[model samples]
Target: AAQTNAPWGLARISSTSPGTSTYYYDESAGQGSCVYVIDTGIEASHPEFEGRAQMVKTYYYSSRDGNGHGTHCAGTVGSRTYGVAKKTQLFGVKVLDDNGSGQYSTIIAGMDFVASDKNNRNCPKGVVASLSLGGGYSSSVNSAAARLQSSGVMVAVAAGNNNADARNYSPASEPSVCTVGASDRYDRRSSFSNYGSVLDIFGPGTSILSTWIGGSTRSISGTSMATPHVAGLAAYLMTLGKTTAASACRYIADTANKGDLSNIPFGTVNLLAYNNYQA
Candidate 1:
């Protein structure tokens, strides 16, 4: 089944098991789509990006990502070698600091920037935002997510790594946002991934090999890793004409694979992220 050279998670989403070695998608996969990564920031010059990644905005003091989380997530979203959406433009919105910590003000500002970008742009077929960080309940953060959805930006966010109910978190608990949890190679929910009714779906999160800072690569696991895969899926869906947030969410719901993921917890869905490439 696992016949291709692609990474397990990437390979897993394209097709159902037994044909599960390649990550399949439509031609020109991410064309006409834009995804904003709100995190530590991205290494814009990473060779895997081939000049597609840019640090478009910084809410914090650092202009660059001294931390590697953002770059790794960006790679999963749209790197030439490791992306789910190969042609999607990658924009970095730095909200977290070098230590990967952010205040509500900075995080909300980043969300607002994405909203403004969506409202100001008329050429993009679809716009998406990937947030791989989360914390305790913050009504302001939740409100920002709601506003982004209203502004037509499809947001995919991490469910956190606390191994607890996701509803206890802010943006993840926000109904306006699409919350993603982590799954492993066997399609079971990752032990560290937060769960609950708030989670929209699962993405491959364990041992994920993606781009890192300084033009390197690493394998790591978290709901953070899983979020970008779906963000990439969101961008890819927009290219298929699911332009609005509601439309994109509907498409994902309809097309996501229904897997028998073990230990999915009480509120988490049984759905796994997919690219609609079942071949």
Candidate 2:
């Protein structure tokens, strides 16, 4: 088990304790960037995230984060200085409500808005979408993600946290998506991180500390924490001229930390050295 530094699993993206990795550090300070966080509404008062996040938009498919799941997820993708895409602009689309659940259509609606740029225009210019929530595998979602890939939009998603086979997760289970799993600071897969042939990479998520509602903090486990690390990395690579989501994704796979899945959910690609690889 990882020790908790904040009341919530959140920590400063610049903090040096816990021997962990935050997404922004994946590349030099990510300035002037953007990504869409498809999750719960941000709480906006966490210290580590002070002046870091901005809500360009908000969608409430649910009433609130009864379990703080969405708030934690929101911080992972864009809690300003503490999230993976710290310097990036954020769009908060609520698919899950206070009830802590949402219909698949709600997510699809958010994606459609993203795909058509209905709510914003930040995506086509170097936007990576972060999805911390997912349901069972769905062919429709896979097709839509593929369309986004073709349109030059990159997406980073959490592999299921159910400890099931890859066949159980959608979008993450899809080939076009940057399927992210979770690992600890020691580079070991979290016991609950879903893995299989569909997985693309892993990031430091086990016992990860991140932001929560009303400026409070806490710890939670799941592939959700792992998703933003890749989102942050994807944003970094995009700044370096990775125009399409597909190419940016390939870049991550080429540089991901490769080792034992029980030790590392992804293959033996060196993530820190990704800048050396072509996107």
Candidate 3:
């Protein structure tokens, strides 16, 4: 039998908590929207995609997924089974290598690719970038992200998993991006998730099961895992007519379930990502 319902992360964002068996969402969730997954790479042939995932660009010669980080994030954003938006266009922009290692230049190249598409009106329906990888603060990367957002692409990023303040990181610390932190099913902040004022919202990140490399599925934990969830929510918002990045970012964070999460430090927003679906 198939799992005919949403995964834990999907269910958590739809409901007030994470124990729901039903995943309520619009049948047209994320319809006519596009999300650029800038991470390792995507195994675009995964069964979970049901022919929706596409490999638009890769920083290397091959767009094949070696690390599975990008693939997992893509799935969480919109896989048929373990996704938040099951009908959106998934574009794989590979920047990191198999070990999930990438320099500022590589990541910037990926950002440039996506931003160029936005500039050319390739994603007029909607455009969002899901960046599940980050490192130390780099002005170049931060500026690229800001430029991407200003160009009408909603930028969702991950607060690094160093358990330190995300304000010290690169794109995550960038104010123009929708920086996401990690929270578990129990509404507890993942211990490894970066925190502080830089984080815009929280998402279910601990051991999330999603599409992986080699046509399989796996549970991985990181702020990386939480990023695409917000991206998916932003994509959904785009479908609902929030065409601007600022509006979509505000919707996800403003409409989030507030002030119930545990382990939240001071200065971080007390908001959990919610898709704003009615039961």
Candidate 4:
């Protein structure tokens, strides 16, 4: 009951009908939710997200994706065949430059813009901020993330690709946010994924194939890929009437598929999972 139209990441987390075109999670595919990607700009014209994606604003770059990181993360959050929330309103809030480099202050400014209603004000029920970037620990970044969470915005952040303790990073170690690490299709932690108590959950990130800039598709790997999976899931949960930022993360934690990673030093990392919306 499915076609080539559904994403594998969604399928892996839920049940799917391969024929007759059916998706168990389709009913809550973020139909009325918004996901904001705060990173390098997105290719708004990418076919996977055309008619649904918008480049809301750019902070350090020229409103386009010279670095495909943002577009790739965006696709994994909302694209029809490669995303968790297929119909989510995708907004690209560019904070990183063409080299995928950015300052902490720039990221804080980007978060402020996403939380404000100064522009079109499309995200009325708050927004899911998907940050695929990371840097050294900073009180400003942590406080900014906390402020966004307190303002009803759910922030999903990467646990960094350094393979070190996530507590050493900014947003990942920040309180009141969903910090995600990378795992493979086999449910094994990615070799380069950061670990420790700071991580909220794990998501498929190894060699993830998704939409890219210039209307292309490619495979990339990192905690960056994993962060969007949780962010997209947050969007899906939002459409299910989960409005509060804390409740969104709480529900995800409660419903996540507990994994068998006892061999890992950080103990078990609960992997993000969903099988349709249940009230």
Among these predictions, the greatest lDDT belongs to 3
Error of 1 at 207 (Å): 0.9
| lDDT tens per residue, model 3, 1-279 | 123455788888888766765667877778788889998888889998888787887777788998888999999998988888888889988889878888798888789889887564455558999999989999899998998888779999999999999989989999978999999888899999999988889998897889998899989999998999999989877887754666677778878999979999988998999877774
Best by TM-score: 3
| Candidate closer to the true structure by TM-score (higher is better), 1 or 2 | 1
Clash pairs detected, candidate 1: 196-267
- Against the unseen true structure, what C-alpha lDDT does each candidate score? 0.85, 0.61, 0.86, 0.77
Clashes of 1: 1
Query: Which stretches in model 3 have alpha-carbon errors above 4 Å?
Result: 1-5, 119-122
Q: Is candidate 1 or candidate 2 better by lDDT?
A: 1
**Would you estimate the TM-scores of all the predictions?**
0.94, 0.78, 0.95, 0.90
The candidates, ranked best first by lDDT, are: 3, 1, 4, 2
- Candidate 1 local lDDT, residue 173: 93
Pairs that collide in candidate 3 are none
For model 2, how does the per-residue alpha-carbon lDDT over 37-133 read when each residue is reduced to its tens digit?
6776555445645555544444553334445666676666656534555556555566667655677776777666666662356443476778888
lDDT of 1 at 85: 87
Taking the candidates one at a time, how many backbone clashes does each contain?
1, 23, 0, 8
